[PDB]
Structure formats: structure tokens, C-alpha cells
Amino acid sequence: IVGGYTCGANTVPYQVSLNSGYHFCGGSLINSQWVVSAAHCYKSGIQVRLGEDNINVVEGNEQFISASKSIVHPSYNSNTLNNDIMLIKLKSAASLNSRVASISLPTSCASAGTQCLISGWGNTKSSGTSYPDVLKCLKAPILSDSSCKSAYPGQITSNMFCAGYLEGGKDSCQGDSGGPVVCSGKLQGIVSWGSGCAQKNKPGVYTKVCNYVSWIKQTIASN
Ligand SMILES: NC(=[NH2+])c1ccc2nc(C(=O)c3nc4ccc(C(N)=[NH2+])cc4[nH]3)[nH]c2c1
Ligand SMILES: [Ca+2]
Ligand SMILES: [Mg+2]
Ligand SMILES: [Zn+2]
Ligand SMILES: [Zn+2]
């Protein structure tokens, strides 16, 4: 997250850290047995860590569970990153409490103007590399599709939306990947891509989760 702040320990209780020996992507808990992340975060052998804040220290409120299965969206295009979403089932169900809770899926799509919260343990420098150990947060509004498509001509589809600041300075970044974008209590986006991080006129591009609720719901009920 570049230009964001420290959330506070367990203040974003639906945030997850995907680990394959190290933290490589984030995810959101949707219920005791399922997580949603990005498809470009697909790897084999993933452990889902919940109640995390500092990912390098065991502070006591964590739950480390391995995944039993990963389902990448059937229409995911790794080249355009269109339909960049993946579901992860846990081997055991997480025990939900104040530090580990699930986030709700949207009933409709959010409007441009809406402020959301984006969180993750990804890079924090635009020019440089700094990886934090605690969760970083960023409040950012949904941008008009017009400004999104001008910045990325011919790259944006109806399953993507941009959020951020065109001036630059503030954006999600590598490592935040798969992470949540919550607007008004609903998970509206997943960190998908952008051009570098926090660059002027290069806002982040997020998977428009409101277009996948039927797919998510149908898949977790049948798996
Ligand atoms: N396991 C891998 N091979 C992997 C995993 C995540 C990655 N993430 C990037 C990346 O390159 C990347 N993830 C981004 C997320 C947000 C923004 C943004 N500017 N908003 C830019 C990003 N760039 N490469 C990745 C490679
Ligand atoms: Ca920890
Ligand atoms: Mg994240
Ligand atoms: Zn990424
Ligand atoms: Zn990149």
C-alpha cells in the first residue's frame, strides 16, 4: 500500500495473508470455510493465515489453515487479467471471533465517488522496495470508468473498476494482490493490477466483485 497508514492490529478482521513459505498475497474471508483472492495469486501449497497483523511475529490471535482446494475463475485471462478472482476452501473451518470475521458480498455494485478501504502487506514505496510487517490501510474512492479507461485505453473491461488518486502517491501495490476493497460494508473489489504503484494518472485496477456473486455463491455451495 503506498501512502496509506497502519490499520491497527486486527482492525480489518476479514483480511487474510496467503503464505507459501512467505506472505505473497492477501485474501478476504467470506465465511468460516472460504476465502476469495485474485487468480493471479494462484500457487500450489498455500496456507491461509487469519488474525494477522504483524506477519513476522506470532502475536497470539492467528489461525494458520492450509487450503484443501483453489478454484480460479473459469474465464480468467492471465494476459488481460480479466476475471481475476479465485476461491480458496480451507481444510478446517476457521473459528470466527472479534479478530477473525467474514466480509459480506455485495447486493449491487458501488458508485463512483464511494470511498472504500483497501488493505495489505504489499510494497509501500513507489520508487523503491519496503515491505511492512503490520497491515497497512488506504481509503480511496472509486473513480469514474471514464478516467479509468483514459488512463488505460483498451485495457479495462466491465469486470474491472479503478480506485485511487490520479495525482498519485496513494495506491495498492504488489503484495496487496488478492486483498479486499470494502465500500459500505461490502467487498466490492480485489486488488488486481495497475501500472507500477502510486504513479500519477495510473490508478489501481480492481476486480469488480459484484459481477461474480452468483458464481461465488454457486461454487462454494457445490464444493
Ligand atoms: N506470485 C507471483 N508470481 C506474483 C504475485 C503477485 C504479483 N503481483 C505482481 C504485480 O506486478 C503487481 N501486483 C499489483 C497489485 C496492485 C498494483 C497497483 N498498482 N495497484 C500493481 C501491482 N503489480 N506481480 C506478481 C507476481
Ligand atoms: Ca503474526
Ligand atoms: Mg491485501
Ligand atoms: Zn499482484
Ligand atoms: Zn506491477
Side-chain angles (χ1 to χ4, degrees), residues 7-15 50-54 59-62 97-100 135:
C7 304
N10 308 297
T11 52
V12 188
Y14 48 81
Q15 169 83 229
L50 317 174
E52 288 279 8
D53 186 44
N54 182 308
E59 291 176 297
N61 303 133
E62 306 90 332
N97 55 65
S98 322
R99 304 183 177 243
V100 183
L135 206 45

PDB file of all heavy atoms in Angstrom, residues 7-15 50-54 59-62 97-100 135:
ATOM      1  N   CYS A   7      -3.252   0.245   9.861  1.00  0.00           N
ATOM      2  CA  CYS A   7      -4.667  -0.060  10.226  1.00  0.00           C
ATOM      3  C   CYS A   7      -4.906  -0.170  11.726  1.00  0.00           C
ATOM      4  O   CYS A   7      -5.780   0.431  12.311  1.00  0.00           O
ATOM      5  CB  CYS A   7      -5.061  -1.370   9.597  1.00  0.00           C
ATOM      6  SG  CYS A   7      -4.867  -1.527   7.805  1.00  0.00           S
ATOM      7  N   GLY A   8      -4.095  -0.975  12.296  1.00  0.00           N
ATOM      8  CA  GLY A   8      -4.153  -1.238  13.734  1.00  0.00           C
ATOM      9  C   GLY A   8      -4.332  -2.751  13.737  1.00  0.00           C
ATOM     10  O   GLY A   8      -4.890  -3.335  12.832  1.00  0.00           O
ATOM     11  N   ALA A   9      -3.851  -3.359  14.771  1.00  0.00           N
ATOM     12  CA  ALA A   9      -3.949  -4.820  14.902  1.00  0.00           C
ATOM     13  C   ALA A   9      -5.393  -5.276  14.912  1.00  0.00           C
ATOM     14  O   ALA A   9      -6.219  -4.785  15.656  1.00  0.00           O
ATOM     15  CB  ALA A   9      -3.267  -5.258  16.207  1.00  0.00           C
ATOM     16  N   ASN A  10      -5.624  -6.229  14.067  1.00  0.00           N
ATOM     17  CA  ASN A  10      -6.953  -6.866  13.871  1.00  0.00           C
ATOM     18  C   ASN A  10      -8.117  -5.890  13.679  1.00  0.00           C
ATOM     19  O   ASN A  10      -9.247  -6.104  14.110  1.00  0.00           O
ATOM     20  CB  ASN A  10      -7.217  -7.756  15.081  1.00  0.00           C
ATOM     21  CG  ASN A  10      -6.012  -8.698  15.316  1.00  0.00           C
ATOM     22  OD1 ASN A  10      -5.690  -9.530  14.501  1.00  0.00           O
ATOM     23  ND2 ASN A  10      -5.305  -8.624  16.403  1.00  0.00           N
ATOM     24  N   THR A  11      -7.833  -4.817  13.001  1.00  0.00           N
ATOM     25  CA  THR A  11      -8.911  -3.826  12.772  1.00  0.00           C
ATOM     26  C   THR A  11      -9.641  -4.204  11.469  1.00  0.00           C
ATOM     27  O   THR A  11     -10.742  -3.742  11.228  1.00  0.00           O
ATOM     28  CB  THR A  11      -8.239  -2.427  12.695  1.00  0.00           C
ATOM     29  OG1 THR A  11      -7.208  -2.609  11.712  1.00  0.00           O
ATOM     30  CG2 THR A  11      -7.609  -2.024  14.078  1.00  0.00           C
ATOM     31  N   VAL A  12      -9.014  -5.025  10.668  1.00  0.00           N
ATOM     32  CA  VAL A  12      -9.592  -5.472   9.373  1.00  0.00           C
ATOM     33  C   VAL A  12      -9.703  -7.011   9.467  1.00  0.00           C
ATOM     34  O   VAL A  12      -8.956  -7.737   8.845  1.00  0.00           O
ATOM     35  CB  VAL A  12      -8.632  -5.036   8.258  1.00  0.00           C
ATOM     36  CG1 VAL A  12      -9.238  -5.286   6.894  1.00  0.00           C
ATOM     37  CG2 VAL A  12      -8.352  -3.541   8.370  1.00  0.00           C
ATOM     38  N   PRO A  13     -10.635  -7.478  10.238  1.00  0.00           N
ATOM     39  CA  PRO A  13     -10.669  -8.890  10.652  1.00  0.00           C
ATOM     40  C   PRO A  13     -10.969  -9.905   9.505  1.00  0.00           C
ATOM     41  O   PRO A  13     -10.876 -11.098   9.708  1.00  0.00           O
ATOM     42  CB  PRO A  13     -11.703  -8.873  11.774  1.00  0.00           C
ATOM     43  CG  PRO A  13     -12.684  -7.784  11.314  1.00  0.00           C
ATOM     44  CD  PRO A  13     -11.759  -6.673  10.785  1.00  0.00           C
ATOM     45  N   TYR A  14     -11.316  -9.424   8.350  1.00  0.00           N
ATOM     46  CA  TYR A  14     -11.623 -10.344   7.201  1.00  0.00           C
ATOM     47  C   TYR A  14     -10.410 -10.453   6.264  1.00  0.00           C
ATOM     48  O   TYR A  14     -10.445 -11.188   5.300  1.00  0.00           O
ATOM     49  CB  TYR A  14     -12.882  -9.794   6.404  1.00  0.00           C
ATOM     50  CG  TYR A  14     -12.710  -8.299   6.109  1.00  0.00           C
ATOM     51  CD1 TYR A  14     -11.947  -7.892   5.043  1.00  0.00           C
ATOM     52  CD2 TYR A  14     -13.267  -7.330   6.926  1.00  0.00           C
ATOM     53  CE1 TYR A  14     -11.733  -6.554   4.792  1.00  0.00           C
ATOM     54  CE2 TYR A  14     -13.050  -5.980   6.679  1.00  0.00           C
ATOM     55  CZ  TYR A  14     -12.269  -5.572   5.592  1.00  0.00           C
ATOM     56  OH  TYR A  14     -11.986  -4.253   5.259  1.00  0.00           O
ATOM     57  N   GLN A  15      -9.382  -9.722   6.584  1.00  0.00           N
ATOM     58  CA  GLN A  15      -8.155  -9.727   5.758  1.00  0.00           C
ATOM     59  C   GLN A  15      -7.436 -11.056   6.064  1.00  0.00           C
ATOM     60  O   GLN A  15      -7.428 -11.532   7.194  1.00  0.00           O
ATOM     61  CB  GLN A  15      -7.272  -8.494   6.164  1.00  0.00           C
ATOM     62  CG  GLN A  15      -5.813  -8.545   5.559  1.00  0.00           C
ATOM     63  CD  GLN A  15      -5.788  -8.021   4.138  1.00  0.00           C
ATOM     64  OE1 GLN A  15      -5.240  -8.641   3.246  1.00  0.00           O
ATOM     65  NE2 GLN A  15      -6.362  -6.879   3.901  1.00  0.00           N
ATOM     66  N   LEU A  50      -4.999 -16.224   9.256  1.00  0.00           N
ATOM     67  CA  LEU A  50      -6.034 -15.304   9.792  1.00  0.00           C
ATOM     68  C   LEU A  50      -5.552 -14.649  11.114  1.00  0.00           C
ATOM     69  O   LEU A  50      -4.620 -15.088  11.728  1.00  0.00           O
ATOM     70  CB  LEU A  50      -7.277 -16.162  10.100  1.00  0.00           C
ATOM     71  CG  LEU A  50      -7.574 -17.204   8.971  1.00  0.00           C
ATOM     72  CD1 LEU A  50      -8.735 -18.121   9.396  1.00  0.00           C
ATOM     73  CD2 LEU A  50      -7.925 -16.484   7.656  1.00  0.00           C
ATOM     74  N   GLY A  51      -6.238 -13.560  11.494  1.00  0.00           N
ATOM     75  CA  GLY A  51      -5.940 -12.757  12.714  1.00  0.00           C
ATOM     76  C   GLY A  51      -4.544 -12.215  12.709  1.00  0.00           C
ATOM     77  O   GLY A  51      -3.900 -12.072  13.732  1.00  0.00           O
ATOM     78  N   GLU A  52      -4.092 -11.908  11.543  1.00  0.00           N
ATOM     79  CA  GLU A  52      -2.734 -11.376  11.409  1.00  0.00           C
ATOM     80  C   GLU A  52      -2.734  -9.900  11.452  1.00  0.00           C
ATOM     81  O   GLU A  52      -3.719  -9.283  11.114  1.00  0.00           O
ATOM     82  CB  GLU A  52      -2.089 -11.727  10.034  1.00  0.00           C
ATOM     83  CG  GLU A  52      -1.707 -13.233   9.906  1.00  0.00           C
ATOM     84  CD  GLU A  52      -0.346 -13.498  10.620  1.00  0.00           C
ATOM     85  OE1 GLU A  52       0.091 -12.572  11.264  1.00  0.00           O
ATOM     86  OE2 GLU A  52       0.181 -14.590  10.486  1.00  0.00           O
ATOM     87  N   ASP A  53      -1.586  -9.451  11.875  1.00  0.00           N
ATOM     88  CA  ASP A  53      -1.316  -8.003  11.954  1.00  0.00           C
ATOM     89  C   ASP A  53       0.183  -7.980  11.548  1.00  0.00           C
ATOM     90  O   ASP A  53       0.525  -7.600  10.443  1.00  0.00           O
ATOM     91  CB  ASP A  53      -1.485  -7.374  13.346  1.00  0.00           C
ATOM     92  CG  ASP A  53      -1.296  -5.836  13.068  1.00  0.00           C
ATOM     93  OD1 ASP A  53      -1.833  -5.331  12.099  1.00  0.00           O
ATOM     94  OD2 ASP A  53      -0.616  -5.187  13.827  1.00  0.00           O
ATOM     95  N   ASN A  54       1.040  -8.409  12.442  1.00  0.00           N
ATOM     96  CA  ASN A  54       2.497  -8.419  12.132  1.00  0.00           C
ATOM     97  C   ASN A  54       2.610  -9.806  11.539  1.00  0.00           C
ATOM     98  O   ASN A  54       2.268 -10.779  12.222  1.00  0.00           O
ATOM     99  CB  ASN A  54       3.326  -8.314  13.397  1.00  0.00           C
ATOM    100  CG  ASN A  54       4.795  -8.275  12.947  1.00  0.00           C
ATOM    101  OD1 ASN A  54       5.214  -9.140  12.197  1.00  0.00           O
ATOM    102  ND2 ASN A  54       5.612  -7.338  13.360  1.00  0.00           N
ATOM    103  N   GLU A  59       1.608 -13.176  17.342  1.00  0.00           N
ATOM    104  CA  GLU A  59       1.124 -12.348  18.461  1.00  0.00           C
ATOM    105  C   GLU A  59      -0.001 -12.993  19.195  1.00  0.00           C
ATOM    106  O   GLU A  59      -0.613 -12.359  20.024  1.00  0.00           O
ATOM    107  CB  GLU A  59       0.725 -10.989  17.880  1.00  0.00           C
ATOM    108  CG  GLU A  59       2.068 -10.269  17.422  1.00  0.00           C
ATOM    109  CD  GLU A  59       1.807  -8.917  16.709  1.00  0.00           C
ATOM    110  OE1 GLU A  59       1.189  -8.922  15.652  1.00  0.00           O
ATOM    111  OE2 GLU A  59       2.271  -7.953  17.301  1.00  0.00           O
ATOM    112  N   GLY A  60      -0.268 -14.228  18.874  1.00  0.00           N
ATOM    113  CA  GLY A  60      -1.370 -14.918  19.605  1.00  0.00           C
ATOM    114  C   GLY A  60      -2.737 -15.053  18.997  1.00  0.00           C
ATOM    115  O   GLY A  60      -3.412 -16.006  19.329  1.00  0.00           O
ATOM    116  N   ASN A  61      -3.148 -14.164  18.136  1.00  0.00           N
ATOM    117  CA  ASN A  61      -4.521 -14.298  17.555  1.00  0.00           C
ATOM    118  C   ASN A  61      -4.575 -14.870  16.189  1.00  0.00           C
ATOM    119  O   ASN A  61      -5.522 -14.590  15.479  1.00  0.00           O
ATOM    120  CB  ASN A  61      -5.173 -12.940  17.496  1.00  0.00           C
ATOM    121  CG  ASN A  61      -5.218 -12.306  18.887  1.00  0.00           C
ATOM    122  OD1 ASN A  61      -4.863 -11.153  19.037  1.00  0.00           O
ATOM    123  ND2 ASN A  61      -5.636 -12.977  19.926  1.00  0.00           N
ATOM    124  N   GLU A  62      -3.623 -15.671  15.851  1.00  0.00           N
ATOM    125  CA  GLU A  62      -3.634 -16.243  14.492  1.00  0.00           C
ATOM    126  C   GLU A  62      -4.177 -17.642  14.423  1.00  0.00           C
ATOM    127  O   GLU A  62      -4.246 -18.353  15.400  1.00  0.00           O
ATOM    128  CB  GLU A  62      -2.250 -16.330  13.901  1.00  0.00           C
ATOM    129  CG  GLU A  62      -1.571 -14.972  13.958  1.00  0.00           C
ATOM    130  CD  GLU A  62      -0.759 -14.721  15.268  1.00  0.00           C
ATOM    131  OE1 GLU A  62      -1.042 -15.239  16.330  1.00  0.00           O
ATOM    132  OE2 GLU A  62       0.163 -13.963  15.148  1.00  0.00           O
ATOM    133  N   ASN A  97     -14.118 -14.923  15.474  1.00  0.00           N
ATOM    134  CA  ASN A  97     -14.162 -14.181  16.753  1.00  0.00           C
ATOM    135  C   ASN A  97     -13.996 -12.714  16.398  1.00  0.00           C
ATOM    136  O   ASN A  97     -14.175 -12.377  15.247  1.00  0.00           O
ATOM    137  CB  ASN A  97     -13.026 -14.722  17.678  1.00  0.00           C
ATOM    138  CG  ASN A  97     -11.662 -14.676  17.039  1.00  0.00           C
ATOM    139  OD1 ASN A  97     -11.150 -13.612  16.758  1.00  0.00           O
ATOM    140  ND2 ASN A  97     -11.043 -15.786  16.791  1.00  0.00           N
ATOM    141  N   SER A  98     -13.679 -11.870  17.325  1.00  0.00           N
ATOM    142  CA  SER A  98     -13.502 -10.416  17.055  1.00  0.00           C
ATOM    143  C   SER A  98     -12.331 -10.055  16.102  1.00  0.00           C
ATOM    144  O   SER A  98     -12.342  -9.047  15.404  1.00  0.00           O
ATOM    145  CB  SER A  98     -13.289  -9.729  18.422  1.00  0.00           C
ATOM    146  OG  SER A  98     -14.164 -10.410  19.326  1.00  0.00           O
ATOM    147  N   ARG A  99     -11.342 -10.903  16.118  1.00  0.00           N
ATOM    148  CA  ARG A  99     -10.122 -10.702  15.276  1.00  0.00           C
ATOM    149  C   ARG A  99     -10.166 -11.431  13.944  1.00  0.00           C
ATOM    150  O   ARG A  99      -9.338 -11.162  13.100  1.00  0.00           O
ATOM    151  CB  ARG A  99      -8.920 -11.179  16.139  1.00  0.00           C
ATOM    152  CG  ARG A  99      -8.959 -10.345  17.500  1.00  0.00           C
ATOM    153  CD  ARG A  99      -7.782 -10.647  18.447  1.00  0.00           C
ATOM    154  NE  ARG A  99      -7.916  -9.750  19.645  1.00  0.00           N
ATOM    155  CZ  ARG A  99      -7.020  -8.839  19.961  1.00  0.00           C
ATOM    156  NH1 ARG A  99      -5.972  -8.620  19.210  1.00  0.00           N
ATOM    157  NH2 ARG A  99      -7.219  -8.112  21.029  1.00  0.00           N
ATOM    158  N   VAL A 100     -11.100 -12.323  13.809  1.00  0.00           N
ATOM    159  CA  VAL A 100     -11.284 -13.133  12.575  1.00  0.00           C
ATOM    160  C   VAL A 100     -12.787 -13.109  12.240  1.00  0.00           C
ATOM    161  O   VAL A 100     -13.558 -13.780  12.908  1.00  0.00           O
ATOM    162  CB  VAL A 100     -10.831 -14.586  12.828  1.00  0.00           C
ATOM    163  CG1 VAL A 100     -10.944 -15.428  11.528  1.00  0.00           C
ATOM    164  CG2 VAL A 100      -9.381 -14.618  13.390  1.00  0.00           C
ATOM    165  N   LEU A 135      -0.230  -4.576   9.069  1.00  0.00           N
ATOM    166  CA  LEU A 135      -1.240  -4.243   7.996  1.00  0.00           C
ATOM    167  C   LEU A 135      -1.346  -2.769   7.706  1.00  0.00           C
ATOM    168  O   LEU A 135      -1.408  -1.988   8.645  1.00  0.00           O
ATOM    169  CB  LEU A 135      -2.585  -4.699   8.452  1.00  0.00           C
ATOM    170  CG  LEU A 135      -3.601  -5.028   7.352  1.00  0.00           C
ATOM    171  CD1 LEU A 135      -2.858  -5.850   6.309  1.00  0.00           C
ATOM    172  CD2 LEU A 135      -4.868  -5.702   7.796  1.00  0.00           C
TER     173      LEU A 135
END
